[PDB]
Design a protein around this ligand. Structure first.
Ligand SMILES: Cc1cc2nc3c(=O)[nH]c(=O)nc-3n(C[C@H](O)[C@H](O)[C@H](O)COP(=O)(O)OP(=O)(O)OC[C@H]3O[C@@H](n4cnc5c(N)ncnc54)[C@H](O)[C@@H]3O)c2cc1C
Ligand SMILES: NC(=O)c1ccc[n+]([C@@H]2O[C@H](COP(=O)([O-])OP(=O)(O)OC[C@H]3O[C@@H](n4cnc5c(N)ncnc54)[C@H](OP(=O)(O)O)[C@@H]3O)[C@@H](O)[C@H]2O)c1
Ligand SMILES: Cc1cc2nc3c(=O)[nH]c(=O)nc-3n(C[C@H](O)[C@H](O)[C@H](O)COP(=O)(O)O)c2cc1C
Length: 609
């Protein structure tokens, strides 16, 4: 429970702001959009600020009308089971319980979500609906960003209509480059005051002190890092992180987050192509001395450290980044292409989508392919988004491994249409960790994916490929429960891989669990061992009769882990078909039945894409 700042409205009054944009963000996307809208205000003669709702009391919204022509915008992402982001949970709870009168308040909401998930943009939709129920008036339509298509474009389209709507309503009206930070180079800086990759307090990585979390990650020693797949088509790995003496608690189903380091070669080349000295110690200080965000990342620090541990230099740059960088491209045609990247349609948009996004060109690739583009290193560092932690489904049970967190991951490495080979940041970094000291900054995030409280409750686990991760923890635990003399209900695993001799993960361990009876059934779909595809859902359909018995009569809990794009939906459709045949009942009622299981905690998801 953080200590709330004083009234954001009073802050706005003292700083001359009329627009405030709150971000409900988990991996920084909403935060970036909010910063962009906040900065846009200036171009229309207004003034804005972005803010984390967790740091404030949104009840002060009722005082916003005290500021003339005021407006509040919410850029909100949705997470686990249509829930708010962790930083927006307090606001969400307040919205549900409050009865405050928001008459006079003007608002707009841009939701960030993904159509492949169950509750698409649930948080954005809720906030938009609730503020109106409380008496506030909507100044622009709810934006529904879909990350399954192209979120950046949905944001661009919405933003392009939003500002004119705001200008028309408030009777205001609308061209230069403005920086948020000023560069301060430090000649004789004490090393003790220089950040070298820590996320929170200076030297927190060196002097570890609990409790450990996102702000203060625990550096866990990699005690094991072995190749899991038999073949060489890809690289799947098993890692074991030593969390001894960290006081960290976890359960099977939770997630472990890690803070990686970017590839040194990429960092070196960015500095090289820009002709910058990456070992310069500096700070980027907010030109707005009132803001709580004094720096874009921990400072003072060297550009090398920033590019390595604090900045995202691998994902396709967003349109505002390319737009601001255009000024540094001396070739007219290149300046024109970069400027047009922010277009909401036409050739400029088509180029952004194909040449930047589809081609997966990162910032270095763009600097190389538009050779006249040579921005100063300090401004680039202010423009780049923050390097995010990566989440992995803990693949161990704390009942069996209380002092170790296991990770099952596939290394990301692919040929992009940009012509170069792109490497996943976290997986390339983890793959290179050699036991005995290889340390990994991490923390555990509690999830709602959990084994049944009653050991006798049957469990149906569906997790092809790396989706098997949490289930290794589940199986370890259920096995442990049997070894403890407890009565354990049926435990069925529906796993899938390409070929038994290519990438059958944990083949030996699973064989052992099956032989010992920890696994009532080990159903494996080898998708490429025959001409037709054989997937986990084909096996579920095969066992429809028994599964229905377990679900309708045995109160079984279903778990689906892995690909959220196609697998999760195909599996869900199969469960619909099963319920529809044995209920019996029409598709519509089958869908409703399965939806209910989810609300009753008997159908859990741990999917990603
Ligand atoms: C809740 C949750 C649980 C997860 N559990 C696990 C897990 O247990 N095991 C696991 O392996 N992963 C899991 N992940 C995924 C993991 O967090 C990372 O996204 C993954 O390891 C890649 O990270 P990276 O830094 O190596 O790659 P990044 O540098 O982040 O690159 C990822 C991006 O590469 C691009 N890309 C990948 N392949 C291609 C391609 N062939 N063509 C074009 N683009 C491509 C995509 O845009 C992808 O988003 C989980 C994610 C979430 C959210
Ligand atoms: O990377 P990763 O860990 O996700 O592993 P992955 O190897 O990409 O996928 C794991 C297994 O899931 C199969 N699969 C692909 N599409 C599926 C679908 N729509 N429904 C059910 N299974 C599907 C894959 O088969 P194919 O790759 O052979 O389709 C493979 O056998
Ligand atoms: C574990 C996980 C769960 C998600 N659950 C949902 C969901 O229920 N509904 C939805 O619309 N989008 C969901 N998304 C997609 C995000 O809302 C979308 O990617 C958003 O752009 C993330 O914004 P952020 O970076 O500001 O947190 C999920 C993403 C992850 C990684």
């Amino acid at each position: 429970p953080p200590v709330k700042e004083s009234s954001f409205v009073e802050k706005m009054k003292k700083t001359g702001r009329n627009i405030i944009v709150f971000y409900g963000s988990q991996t920084g996307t909403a935060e970036e959009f909010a910063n962009r809208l906040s900065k846009d205000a200036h171009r229309y003669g207004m003034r804005g600020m972005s803010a984390d709702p967790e740091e404030y009391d949104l009840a002060d919204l009722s005082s916003l009308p005290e500021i003339d022509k005021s407006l509040v915008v919410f850029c909100m992402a949705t997470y686990g089971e249509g829930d708010p982001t962790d930083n927006a949970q307090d606001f969400y709870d307040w919205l549900q319980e409050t009865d405050v009168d928001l008459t006079g308040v003007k608002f707009a909401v841009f939701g960030l979500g993904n159509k492949t998930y169950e509750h698409f943009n649930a948080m954005g939709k809720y906030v938009d609906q609730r503020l109106e129920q409380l008496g506030a008036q909507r100044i622009f339509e709810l934006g529904l960003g879909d990350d399954d298509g192209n979120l950046e474009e949905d944001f661009i389209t919405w933003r392009e209509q939003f500002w004119p709507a705001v200008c028309e309503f408030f009777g205001v009206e609308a061209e230069s480059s403005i920086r948020q930070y000023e560069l301060v180079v430090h000649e004789d800086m004490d090393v003790a005051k220089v950040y070298t990759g820590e996320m929170g307090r200076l030297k927190s990585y060196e002097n570890q002190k609990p409790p450990f979390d996102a702000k203060n990650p625990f550096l866990a020693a990699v005690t094991a890092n072995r190749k899991l797949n038999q073949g060489t088509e890809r690289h799947l790995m098993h890692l074991e992180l030593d969390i001894s003496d960290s006081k960290i608690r976890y359960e099977s189903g939770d997630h472990v987050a890690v803070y990686p380091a970017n590839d040194s070669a990429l960092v070196n080349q960015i500095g090289e192509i820009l002709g910058a000295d990456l070992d310069v110690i500096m700070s980027l200080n907010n030109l707005d001395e009132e803001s709580n965000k004094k720096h874009p990342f921990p400072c003072p620090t060297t550009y090398r450290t920033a590019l390595t541990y604090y900045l995202d230099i691998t994902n396709p740059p967003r349109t505002n980044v390319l737009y601001e960088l255009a000024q540094y491209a001396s070739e007219p045609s290149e300046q024109e292409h970069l400027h047009k990247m922010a277009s909401s349609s036409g050739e400029g948009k088509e180029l952004y989508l194909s040449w930047v996004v589809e081609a997966r060109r990162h910032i270095l690739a763009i600097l190389q392919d538009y050779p006249s583009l040579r921005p100063p290193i300090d401004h680039l560092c202010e423009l780049l988004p923050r390097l995010q932690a990566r989440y992995y489904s803990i693949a161990s049970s704390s009942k069996v491994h209380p002092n170790s967190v296991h990770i099952c991951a596939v290394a990301v490495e692919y040929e992009a249409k940009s012509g170069r080979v792109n490497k996943g940041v976290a997986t390339s970094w983890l793959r290179a960790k050699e036991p005995a000291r290889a340390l990994v900054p991490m923390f555990v995030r509690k999830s709602q994916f959990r084994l049944p409280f009653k050991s006798t409750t049957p469990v149906i686990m569906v997790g092809p490929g790396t989706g098997i991760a949490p289930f290794m923890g589940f199986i370890q635990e259920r096995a442990w429960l049997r070894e403890q003399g407890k009565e354990v209900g049926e435990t069925l695993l529906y796993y899938g891989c390409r070929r038994s001799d290519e990438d059958y993960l944990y083949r030996e361990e699973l064989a052992r669990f099956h032989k010992d009876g920890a696994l009532t059934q080990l159903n494996v779909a080898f998708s490429r061992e025959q001409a037709h595809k054989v997937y986990v859902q084909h096996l579920l359909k095969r066992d429809r009769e028994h599964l229905w018995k377990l679900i309708h009569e045995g109160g079984a809990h279903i778990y689906v882990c892995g690909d959220a794009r196609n697998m999760a939906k195909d599996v869900q459709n199969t469960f619909y078909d099963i319920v529809a045949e044995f209920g019996p009942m029409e598709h519509t009622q089958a869908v409703d039945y399965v939806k209910k299981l989810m609300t009753k905690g008997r159908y859990s998801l741990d999917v990603w894409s």
